[PDB]
């Protein structure tokens, strides 16, 4: 049995279960406001510096935090937040000057200096218990017209590498807004798909060996491929009403967008041509890069096979066991407990109804009380 | 529910018409010279659930009996004690399922199921509701449902 051959109702139920599973790992609005206030305070303290180099600094979010695709890391209590500062007067500043300015300014503050920790690319603040702060220095880049934010960022080896965070965010937000046409009868979707794929990747990575663990797919490559696949299906105007069919189609279209040129693999930022998200894939020293090309394809095959496996399950117990195997036990436990509470309430409320054709329970012919002993 | 006592245990003929209206039934028979009423069919607890065959027996003056034949349920049990089973029915094969509360425990004297209620109204919805909690007993190891009283000495039979 394949996931495509199932009726609409079964696939829709599987999709609802997947969405409810993902909702657990997502961060709430209150925590988001907490982090926003924290990094706004850090940036405001920075701008107070008397040093001309550090003056006019601004902090804005980056990565998964900006794109609203955060998934709680498994076995880790701390969510990750990574942000980048922008110094307009650092157009020709030196690396050491910016590093020293930021380091001394952060060391000055009583609360901040105790939790401060150095990172290879920047600085980190060890907020205790549930979330992290990552800061990356940045110089403006001039001479390349594009929708927004040409910039230099700091990489230890080259001391300056090209990047464009805001353009990627604008492109993703513009892409995710459009909705596929749904067949007529007689969070955005792309965000959810990316989060589901990342959760499945995190589950798959743990079992594998060290070489497959290190070379596991990165989040940004999956994000770019998923956006590229989503654009193709939204343009072709294919009609989908089966919710896992969209995920299957996007995942199937994903590997066609890896581009090879003169033996070099390029997955590129749409706005900045010099932003290679697959740079380590190209480097074949000790065959480390070539293994990463096999890891993505093995993950793609496994992720295709997992929904066939779920589709083959008969029995509610088998379905829940398959979901536990695929997307972690602890997220699934909450969903099943919620289902039992709703069923108990429906038994109390009297909204438990019996289907005519199958005799299946309908949770919302009111079922009388005390069916048991 | 506070109702007048003029209502009386209906005869087999009135109960006969009830089952045909609701659901698909394989057979509906009257045996022992119109003494007994039999119903069989296929019940699915949920969308992903298994396939279950259920049999219901009734005679006037006796409480109804619910028996589930296929699947055997004991291969699925794995010899662990399946909860909520009455003494086995000799004539009809298969496990017997307890799905009501008898008259003795009820203080008001009105059982949870009485002869006034039609057989199709509650016996199958309860049996289907029984089957839903059965599978959830597995994979959890607990009977997350309305449990029987911690009887100190009573036998309920």
CB contact under 8 A, A314 and B146: no
Chain A CB contacts of B148 under 8 Å are 372-373
Taking Cα atoms as reference points, which of B60, B44, B57 lies closest to residue B97?
B57
Distance from CA of B5 to the nearest CA of A (A): 20
Chain B CB contacts of A373 under 8 Å are 84, 98, 101, 146-149, 156
User: What is the CA A183 to chain-centroid distance, rounded?
Assistant: 29
Q: Does B148 touch chain A (CB under 8 A)?
A: yes
The experimental technique used to determine this model is: cryo-EM
Length, in residues, of chain B: 157
Under 8 Å CB pairs connecting chains A and B tally to 100
Token reading at A363: 């949770």
What gap in Å lies between CA B47 and CA A328, rounded to an integer?
23
Token reading at A325: 């195997």
Query: For strand A58-62 and strand A116-118, is the pairing parallel, antiparallel, or unpaired?
Result: unpaired
List the single residue in B23, B50, B147 with the smallest CB-CB distance to A359: B23
Query: Which residues, in sequence order, are CB contacts of A180 under 8 Å at separation 6+?
Result: A189, A233, A234, A238, A239, A240, A246
CB contact under 8 A, B144 and A340: yes
A295-300: list long-range contacts, CB under 8 Å, 24+ apart: A295/A212, A295/A215, A295/A216, A295/A217, A296/A217, A296/A221, A296/A255, A297/A255, A298/A212, A299/A201, A299/A204, A299/A216, A299/A217, A300/A251, A300/A254, A300/A255
Residue A233 vs residues A50, A227, A238, A245, A277: alpha-carbon distances, Å = 53, 10, 6, 12, 23
Is the alpha carbon torsion for A315, A318, A322, A324 positive or negative?
Answer: positive
Are the beta carbons of A227 and A171 closer than 8 angstroms? Answer: yes
Query: For strand A133-136 and strand A82-86, is the pairing parallel, antiparallel, or unpaired?
Result: parallel
Containing H/E element for A123?
strand A123-125
Query: Helix crossing, A316-327 with B119-137: angle to 10°?
Result: 30
Q: Does B155 touch chain A (CB under 8 A)?
A: no
Distance from CA of A357 to the nearest CA of B (A): 5
CB contact under 8 A, A358 and B126: no
Declared resolution, Å: 3.3
Q: Does B110 touch chain A (CB under 8 A)?
A: no
Q: Is B40 exposed, middle or buried (0-12, 13-18, 19+ CB in 10 A)?
A: middle
CB contact under 8 A, A313 and B48: yes
Chain A CB contacts of B47 under 8 Å are 9-10, 13, 360
List the single residue in B48, B132, B156 with the smallest CB-CB distance to A314: B48
CB contact under 8 A, B99 and A371: yes
Range list of H helices, chain A: 8-25, 29-47, 64-67, 95-108, 110-115, 165-177, 189-207, 210-214, 219-236, 243-253, 279-282, 288-312, 316-327, 329-349
Distance from CA of A302 to the nearest CA of B (A): 23
Phi-psi region of A222 (alpha: psi -120 to 50; beta: other; left: phi over 0): alpha
Distance from CA of A15 to the nearest CA of B (A): 14
Query: Which residues, in sequence order, are CB contacts of A328 under 8 Å at separation 6+?
Result: A74, A199, A203
Query: Helix crossing, A243-253 with A288-312: angle to 10°?
Result: 160
Are the beta carbons of A168 and A63 closer than 8 angstroms? Answer: no
Chain A CB contacts of B133 under 8 Å are 372
For B49, nearest residue in chain A (alpha carbons): A315
Q: Cis check for the bond before A255: say yes or no (omega within 30 of 0).
A: no
Taking Cα atoms as reference points, which of A129, A367, A112, A125 lies closest to residue B132?
A367
Chain A CB contacts of B45 under 8 Å are 316, 360-361
CATH class of A29-140: alpha beta
């Amino acid at each position: 049995t394949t996931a495509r051959n199932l009726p609409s109702g079964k696939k829709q139920r599987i999709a609802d279960l997947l969405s409810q599973i993902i909702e657990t790992l997502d961060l709430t609005k209150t925590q988001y406001a907490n982090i926003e206030s924290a990094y706004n305070g850090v940036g405001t303290f920075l701008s107070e510096g008397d040093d001309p180099l550090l003056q006019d600094a601004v902090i804005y979010p980056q990565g998964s935090v900006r794109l609203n695709t955060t998934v709680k890391p498994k076995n880790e209590e701390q969510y990750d937040i990574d942000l980048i500062c922008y110094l307009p007067h650092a157009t020709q500043a030196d690396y050491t000057g910016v590093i020293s300015a930021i380091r001394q300014r952060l060391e000055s503050h009583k609360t901040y200096k105790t939790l401060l920790s150095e990172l290879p690319r920047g600085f980190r603040i060890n907020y205790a218990g549930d979330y992290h702060l990552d800061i990356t220095p940045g110089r403006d880049h001039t001479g390349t017209a594009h929708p927004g934010q040409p910039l230099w960022v700091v990489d230890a080896q080259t001391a300056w590498k090209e990047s464009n965070p805001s353009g990627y965010a604008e492109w993703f937000e513009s892409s995710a807004s459009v909705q596929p046409l749904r067949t007529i009868l007689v969070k955005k979707l792309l965000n959810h798909i990316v989060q589901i794929l990342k959760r499945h990747r995190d589950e798959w990575a743990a079992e594998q060996d060290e070489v497959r663990q290190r070379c596991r797919p990165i989040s940004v490559i999956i994000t770019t491929l998923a956006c590229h696949a989503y654009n193709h299906i939204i343009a072709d105007r294919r009609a989908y009403d089966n919710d896992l069919d969209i995920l299957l189609d996007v995942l199937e279209l994903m590997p066609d967008f890896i581009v090879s040129t003169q033996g070099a693999i390029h997955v590129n930022n749409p706005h900045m041509p010099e932003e290679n998200f697959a740079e380590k894939w190209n480097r074949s020293e000790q065959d480390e890069g070539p293994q990463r090309s096999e890891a993505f394809y093995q993950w793609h095959a496994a992720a295709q096979a997992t929904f066939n496996t779920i589709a083959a399950s008969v029995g509610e117990d088998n379905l829940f066991l398959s979901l536990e195997d695929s997307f972690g036990k602890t997220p699934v436990d909450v969903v099943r407990q919620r289902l039992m509470e709703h069923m108990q309430s429906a038994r109390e409320q009297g909204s438990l109804h019996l289907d005519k054709k199958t005799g299946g329970l309908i949770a919302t012919a009111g079922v009388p009380k005390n069916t048991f002993y | 529910v506070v109702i007048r006592h003029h209502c009386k245990p209906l005869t087999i003929a009135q109960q006969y018409r009830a089952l045909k209206a609701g659901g698909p039934y394989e057979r509906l028979r009257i045996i022992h010279h119109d003494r007994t009423l039999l119903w069989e069919g296929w019940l699915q607890p949920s969308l992903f659930s298994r396939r279950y065959k259920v049999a219901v027996r009734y005679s006037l003056g006796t409480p109804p009996i619910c028996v589930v034949t296929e699947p055997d349920l004991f291969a699925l049990a794995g010899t662990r004690a399946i909860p909520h089973l009455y003494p086995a029915d000799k004539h009809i094969p298969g496990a017997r399922l307890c799905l009501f509360l008898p008259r003795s425990q009820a203080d008001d004297g009105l059982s949870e199921w009485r002869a006034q209620l039609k057989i199709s109204d509650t016996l199958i919805p309860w049996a289907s509701l029984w089957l839903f909690y059965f599978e959830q007993w597995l994979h959890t190891g607990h009977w997350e449902g309305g449990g029987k009283h911690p009887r100190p000495s009573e036998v309920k039979n």
